[PDB]
Design a protein around this ligand. Sequence first.
Ligand SMILES: CC[C@H](C)CN(C[C@@H](O)[C@H](Cc1ccccc1)NC(=O)O[C@H]1CO[C@H]2OCC[C@H]21)S(=O)(=O)c1ccc2c(c1)OCO2
Lengths: 99, 99
Amino acid sequence: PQITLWKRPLVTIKIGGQLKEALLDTGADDTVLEEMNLPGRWKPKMIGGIGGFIKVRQYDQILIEICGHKAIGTVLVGPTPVNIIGRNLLTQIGCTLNF
Amino acid sequence: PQITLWKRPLVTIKIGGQLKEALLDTGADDTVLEEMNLPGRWKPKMIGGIGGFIKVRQYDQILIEICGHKAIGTVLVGPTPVNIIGRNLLTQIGCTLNF
Ligand SMILES: CC[C@H](C)CN(C[C@@H](O)[C@H](Cc1ccccc1)NC(=O)O[C@H]1CO[C@H]2OCC[C@H]21)S(=O)(=O)c1ccc2c(c1)OCO2
């Protein structure tokens, strides 16, 4: 579909058997999800933005379905205020900026 | 143009008569630029990112040119890690997400 930017580009996603709302974020290198209990191994990471850094847990090869489009890649989990779909997964669903 | 997301969506902007590089950031409500000298008056404001809240200078009705597209809107100036173009200006140049 085509999504205008009058409002936040929030879409429904499916990850780890849960439906959530997440931001399609072209400014996010990586995908960062609100705190959740995912199984499997992980490694710690820190990611920076406005206000400083947050500590996150990095899971690899995590499947996420975005508006019916399937994608699999690295997913960071930590105390983010919002679910953020980053470019690592946006590329996989064929998302582009257009103007 | 149609911009894929395998790289950061970085573009050249023109503000205050000076060229800079900025990130098209659909996950940002507002446009936030690194510390710089801008003409006109400003008001102190606070914005929160992933890592917390920062102090910024708010400039209203500022002319910015993005990839040759003219916009006039609010521009926040403060200690952001990257020049980011937010939805307040992305809408003015006709930007949409598509997949
Ligand atoms: C360094 C470039 C940006 C600041 C990076 N951010 C993505 C933004 O889209 C962020 C995503 C975002 C959105 C809401 C809350 C927290 C983070 N939005 C943001 O900070 O916008 C602010 C300015 O406008 C205001 O509206 C939204 C917040 C304000 S981020 O969330 O900090 C981020 C996400 C994934 C990352 C990462 C940083 O490092 C590598 O992987």
